[PDB]
C-alpha cells in the first residue's frame, strides 16, 4: 500500500455529486481506519467508456494550484492492472452556483454577489499568474463552500500558455462552452487570459440573475440568433458579437456593476479589463 495516495477500497461511496467532461464526481468518506472518523471527499472518476490522459492533465493542473478560491487538491487514487486514476478534492457541500443560487435568492443579496465576483476574480488572477487559461468559466464550475465562500471547482478544459506567449491554440474544441466564449476563441480557437475575462463577464451575468435557467447565456443568445441553426450557431454568435450586441443588464444590477461586465466584453482581447482591475473595481463598490 502507498500511504501517500488514496486507497480505492477505503473511498467509501456515498452519493453522486455531478458529471464533468472526462469524469463524474461522487461524494465518498475516506475511512481507512474503519471507525467512521475519516473525512468526506469529492472524487472524480472516468465515466463508463473522453479519456484517462485528459483526467491526468487535470490532476497535473490541480496539483499545481493552491488558492483560497480554488477547489483544494487532496490526492489521487491509482487503479490496479490498468491505466485508471481518480482525482480527490475537498468536498464543497453546497455544490455549484448554478444549483445554489436559485435556492437562495432571498438569502444572497447584491453585496454577497459582489463578494463572490471578487473571490472568482482572485481565483482567476491566481490561475493566470500560473500561466493557465481556464476555458470553461461558467457558474456551473464555481462551487459554493458556504454562503460566504466560493471556489473555482473544475479544470477539465484548462490549458497552459507557453512562457512569453499570449494565447494557447485549441486543436480540440469539441465541447467548448461557445456561449461563454470570446470572439477570438470562436473565430480562431485562440485562448488568452483576456478570453477568461470575457467568460467571467458571462459568469457575472449568471450570478446577478441567480442562475435563472430562462436567463442563461445560452437561452438569451439563442433568443437573439434563433434556435434552429445547428452547425451555423457559432457563425451566428460571431455575427451578433461583431455587430456589438451583448447580453443586457440584469434587472436590479446597478449600472456601475454592468459597466464592469461590459469591460469584460470588448471585442479585442487587448481592450478588456484585467482580473486584478476587476477585483479593485468590485471592492470599490463594497463598503
Ligand atoms: C460537475 C462538476 C464536475 C463541475 C462538479 N460538480 C461538483 C459538485 C457538485 C455538487 C457538490 F455538492 C459538490 C461538488 C464538488 C465538490 O464538492 N468538490 C469538488 C468538485 C465538485 C464538483 N465538480
From Swiss-Prot:
It is found in: Endomembrane system. ATP binds at residues 17-25, 44. GO terms for molecular function: ATP binding; CCR5 chemokine receptor binding; growth hormone receptor binding; metal ion binding; non-membrane spanning protein tyrosine kinase activity; protein phosphatase binding; protein tyrosine kinase activity; ubiquitin protein ligase binding. It comes from the Eukaryota. One of its GO terms (biological process) is interleukin-11-mediated signaling pathway. Its main location: membrane. The modification Phosphotyrosine is found at residues 167-168. Autophosphorylated. Phosphorylated by TYK2 on tyrosine residues in response to type-I interferon signaling, leading to its activation. Phosphorylated on tyrosine residues in response to interferon gamma signaling. Dephosphorylation of Tyr-167 and Tyr-168 by PTPN2 negatively regulates cytokine-mediated signaling. It is linked to Autoinflammation, immune dysregulation, and eosinophilia: An autosomal dominant disorder characterized by immune dysregulation, severe atopic dermatitis, and chronic gastrointestinal inflammation. Additional features include asthma, food or environmental allergies, as well as poor overall growth with short stature. Belongs to the protein kinase superfamily. Tyr protein kinase family. JAK subfamily. This is Tyrosine-protein kinase JAK1. The lineage of its organism: Eukaryota, Metazoa, Chordata, Craniata, Vertebrata. The chain holds residues 865 to 1154 of 1154 of the full protein.
